[PDB]
């Protein structure tokens, strides 16, 4: 706890009756409080980064279960993530310095700024 400075207190006021369904690699604890009441508020995630958290830290294995699109906890879709090309999440580093943010291939901030001139000069 010790955060009376966030809405994280609203999540920690949840979890009082909720059951913990799995926890992904990053530490985000995925909770479920069904049966009681208030559909739409019976699946959430405790981000395990009580500060500096934001959305999109929820990996794709769980981002289904947590938006109610599926009923497969990330401990069940982890047997379906492709091993050959599977890639870990990236938290959406939007703005947090260059080389973390994404860059196109001509942005002059991207190492290896490609030239698009279709004609090959002499």
């Amino acid at each position: 706890r010790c955060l009376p400075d966030g809405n994280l207190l609203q999540t920690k006021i949840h979890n009082i009756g909720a059951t913990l369904v799995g926890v992904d690699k990053f530490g985000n604890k995925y909770y479920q409080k069904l049966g009681d009441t208030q559909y739409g508020r019976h699946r959430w995630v405790e981000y395990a980064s009580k500060d500096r958290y934001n959305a999109s830290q929820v990996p794709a294995e769980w981002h289904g279960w947590l938006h109610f699109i599926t009923d497969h906890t990330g401990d069940e879709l982890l047997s379906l993530k492709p091993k050959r090309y599977g890639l870990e999440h990236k938290e959406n580093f939007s703005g947090e310095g260059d080389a973390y943010i994404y860059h196109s291939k001509g942005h002059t901030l991207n190492p290896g700024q490609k030239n698009w001139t279709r004609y090959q000069s002499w």
């Binding site: 400075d5 739409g40 934001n54 999109s56 703005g95």
Partner: protein, 153 residues
């Protein structure tokens, strides 16, 4: 030491990130999605965001919908009368970039042509949570300000 400066920046940023009232230039549907992001389910009054109806006192300006070439001067005139610690959020494809109407003669190719933008909520009809996450990214942009440390150079 510098620690006092670090904490006074943390405090200023906590203020400007807690109470960030946007002048919601709700043009078009992304204003209907913004109204859903102001509605009961995804509260914006929870995060402090209070939709101001006037440009005079507003920390932000969530331009949404198709910025028309005729509503470009009005958007600029509204942006020029916000108090200096202001930010702009582009919500929807039509507001952030050219969008469905990139090649329309009457549509500016993204408000990035009129006002300087700080967070582009992506998705042409952004989910109400997506605009909410765009605002939770504007909150990060505040938390990376440290204006006092820069005033001390």
């Amino acid at each position: 030491a510098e620690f006092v400066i670090s904490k006074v920046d943390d405090l200023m940023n906590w203020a400007r990130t807690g109470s960030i009232w946007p002048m919601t230039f709700g043009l078009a549907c992304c204003a209907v999605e913004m109204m859903h992001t102001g509605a009961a389910r995804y509260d914006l009054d929870r995060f402090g965001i209070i939709f101001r109806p006037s440009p005079r006192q507003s920390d932000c300006m969530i331009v949404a919908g198709t910025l028309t070439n005729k509503m470009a001067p009005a958007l600029r005139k509204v942006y020029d009368q916000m108090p200096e610690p202001r930010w702009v959020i582009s919500m929807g494809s039509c507001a952030n970039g050219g969008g469905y109407y990139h090649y329309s003669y009457s549509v500016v190719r993204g408000c990035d042509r009129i006002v300087p933008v700080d967070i582009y909520v992506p998705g042409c009809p952004p989910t109400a949570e997506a605009l909410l996450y765009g605002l939770l990214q504007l909150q990060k942009k505040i938390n990376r300000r440290k204006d006092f440390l820069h005033w001390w150079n």
